[PDB]
Subunit: 190 residues, 2 copies
Amino acid sequence: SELRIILVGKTGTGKSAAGNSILRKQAFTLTKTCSKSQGSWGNREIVIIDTPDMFSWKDHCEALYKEVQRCYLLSAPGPHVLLLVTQLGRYTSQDQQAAQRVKEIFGEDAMGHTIVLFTHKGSLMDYMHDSDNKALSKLVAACGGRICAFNNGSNQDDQVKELMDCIEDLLMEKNGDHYTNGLYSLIQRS
Amino acid sequence: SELRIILVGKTGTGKSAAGNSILRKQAFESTLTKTCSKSQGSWGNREIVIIDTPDMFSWKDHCEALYKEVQRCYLLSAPGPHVLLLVTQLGRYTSQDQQAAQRVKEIFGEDAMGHTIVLFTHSLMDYMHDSDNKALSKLVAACGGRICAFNNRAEGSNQDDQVKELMDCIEDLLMEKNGDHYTNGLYSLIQRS
């Protein structure tokens, strides 16, 4: 009864650190390859697939295509949730590019399983309300307003609980179904 | 002892028709090519396997379908191509052909040019010397001067001659490569998937 999470985001958002917080272990310099770590939270078995920083970059190369294939192989038969990790008050073209790559790598429908994570160091809804960023508003609306703040002990357990609550809410809405596409179906036959 | 050929090129270069000429059969539909196709034939004592790729490989953007077709291409051409035929139209090398060449490097790796032969669909050295396109010369130099002219409407004896001309280029490349096919980390990943 595993829960598969794909971490996506630009360099310096603390993507790997958020994965280590969820698994409560050192499960995961630039991230150059996909990594997979297994852990738990409560009664739940959690599988996290960390992706390279280059997923958020503009260009393409052999390594990118290879890592898209590993991501698919490591997250097969599909992710339950895609965590788009971004930094509070610092949503730039690089974050827009990372969001766009989620749609290009997994299909437009992947946004239906995406939660936007806001890393920093109620109060989040206060900043969103006054946000003058048209691109960020477009992303949050595309992710059905599924947003969660995250500061990267007790306070750490609380923000994981907050995020696990978002994830569970999405899962309940999806009746526990993971996201899938034609490439996942192709892997499943081969 | 099969010989694997991947066909790459922009829309309208007669990419599928060249594949059909090499195999001497209607192996591929020659509309847009939307998916990868594989057809087998023979030449001499060698089995020729041809992997036709979508026109979108020569396009600027990326999508789910492109990543799916990259995977099929890799699966159909595994453990790797001996040769990549970059099909271009003699007298019409544009930014779209430059993009197709660039995508060979992005899909298969920079070193892939080392296994690439430029096919000119339509004396060829005469049209080459008449050309003043700097981008095209840069591509031909990147492909070690491995160029070949092709008439996709050629039949019988003339058809056999242009395949022989191309098979000569391929054999020259193969000798240089010591019969080795081109490979990368993604072909290795597919092979163990």
